[PDB]
Symmetry: C2
Subunit: 334 residues, 2 copies
């Protein structure tokens, strides 16, 4: 029988209905903030060298698109591309708690894997996904990462925070890919037994550019593992609480993850934005207009007028964007 920590995630992602206008309206702005941050990274040859397929010239049927390019890749290599771009310059949204992290990093996994399912449905004459289903996964992915991060500090045990990106992404993407309770339970358990990056690359005298791509490697890892679950691959029920071998004993010094509050809409409502306080939740009437210009400036830097216009027409209206099929939106960014 599965660790009750894993069950609480699985049930939240499967069954919870977000009813907060405030959470969706903020999800909307977090999407287009993050996307522009990615566009701005493309200016930088350190980022770009890490992008594309593994082997140039690969052809992937109905494969997931990378914005600002004409690449189309498998949902796993598409997720790392998007993840690494959006986090590269350290300008994306933020959540400071016991653990410090960037919940927008999960977009890579969610969005690459949502474009791919949409292009496949459309080719099979079925109904694609909508951009509303992506805010919805983004809200849920902020929640799971952010709530565990409130009281549980993984830096005091030597590990990088991107661990919580692995977990959050695997949970919402498995869903998502349309798996069974049992299968999603297996997928999340597989995340916990995985290996977890150190944070050596974040500190003097080893500070280095894996600080920029570590999160993108996690969200991509999430998608690889979710698709393994899709096959029927088994899970590991006592992955956290197992004596000697489980995660608590090996990596968290025998202590338990302690979660103060139940999962809801709490993180996306109160997230911080780097839009130069203004980027705070209470000052959103000052900060939202500053965000739109940042998004406006960044479109200008990869796209010409007409394109930057026709993207801005759909995007700056919450309805309209919500209703739009994800394959059709992401096309706008080629």
């Amino acid at each position: 029988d599965f660790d009750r920590e894993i069950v609480d995630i699985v049930d939240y992602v499967m069954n919870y209905e977000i009813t907060s206008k405030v959470a969706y309206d903020t999800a909307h702005y977090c999407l287009l903030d993050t996307l522009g941050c990615g566009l701005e990274a493309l200016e930088y040859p350190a980022c770009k060298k890490l992008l594309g397929p593994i082997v140039p010239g690969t052809v992937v049927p109905n494969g997931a698109r990378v914005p600002g390019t004409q690449f189309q890749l498998d949902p796993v290599q598409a997720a790392f591309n998007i993840g690494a771009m959006i986090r590269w310059l350290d300008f994306n949204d933020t959540w400071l708690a016991a653990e410090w992290g960037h919940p927008s990093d999960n977009l890579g996994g969610i969005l690459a894997t949502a474009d791919w399912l949409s292009r496949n449905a459309v080719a099979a004459g079925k109904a694609p996904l909508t951009m509303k289903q992506v805010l919805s996964g983004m809200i849920k992915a902020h929640e799971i990462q952010g709530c565990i991060a409130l009281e549980n500090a993984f830096n005091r045990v030597g590990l990088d925070h991107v661990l919580l990106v692995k977990v959050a992404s695997t949970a919402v993407v498995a869903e998502m890919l349309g798996l069974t309770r049992d299968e999603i339970l297996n997928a999340v358990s597989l995340a916990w037994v995985d290996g977890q990056s150190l944070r050596t690359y974040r500190h003097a005298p080893n500070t280095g550019t894996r600080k920029s791509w570590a999160a993108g490697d996690a969200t991509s890892r999430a998608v690889r593992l979710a698709l393994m679950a899709k096959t029927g691959e088994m899970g590991y029920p006592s992955a956290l609480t197992a004596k000697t071998w489980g995660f608590y004993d090996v990596s968290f010094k025998g202590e338990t993850f302690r979660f103060q509050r139940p999962y809801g809409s709490y993180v996306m409502e109160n997230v911080l934005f780097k839009i130069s306080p203004i980027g705070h939740a209470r000052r959103r009437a000052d900060g939202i207009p500053k965000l739109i210009e940042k998004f406006k400036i960044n479109l200008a830097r990869q796209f010409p007028t007409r394109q930057q216009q026709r993207i801005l027409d759909v995007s700056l209206d919450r309805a309209r964007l919500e209703q739009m099929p994800v394959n059709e939106y992401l096309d706008l960014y080629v």
Copy 2:
């Protein structure tokens, strides 16, 4: 300046010349033993559900072949396919020390990456790689994994042994791809800062089928990380010995990795074979004939007589095999 542990690997892999007839002659038999183990796994739907490309229908120019199929993939996905097959049934070669492991698991990384570089060269009118270069990488990969495993037990710290597969493969592959001292040094350091799988899946009450594929995920991870290095990706010099953040402090309880002897031909010479002692190094006149039948039985179970024959004609002669171009051999297995 790099941790001396990492330098000693890089230099061994770059510069060391194997002069031990006994090491090459054993390498020869370890290759075809391991390959036949992989062929036998294909009987088993648990294995096969994990194989193929991520997205059926992908086309990879000059892509690395998976024996017993017609698949041709990118060298990352090809390495996991081969790895997972050869280790699946727990019948491949073995090395028992302070740490227990299967050095043949590195064939996946070395071989998928060697078929790819060959195809490749041959498309560009250049000269391909030879089956002798693969025994030679196999010898060196047994050495690095096996020597660290002599005195350093990663199970008393909660981690899976496949850690040493990550490391060994990254090192020989990076060399095989033709990178510089500095670049292999960066690649290997990237392996150490990576995250390391637990061994929860190996023990009651969580024993499960990740016991079969954990190694194949490592050798594939090795190839992904070497090709990063290829881009110019930086390394992390004090990855082991860094205070607070390095590996020793976080994962090995402040203690140092202690390697008793210098790297040479020692592991492949003394490796154990599951050829039902007979599988010992001293009893090789009893065990070698038993090995050839095991190899013979396994060819019969995926290939018809003529093909079985024409594979057996090249393979059972050490010269003839040595001299044969790796793309051409592996074609024999389609």
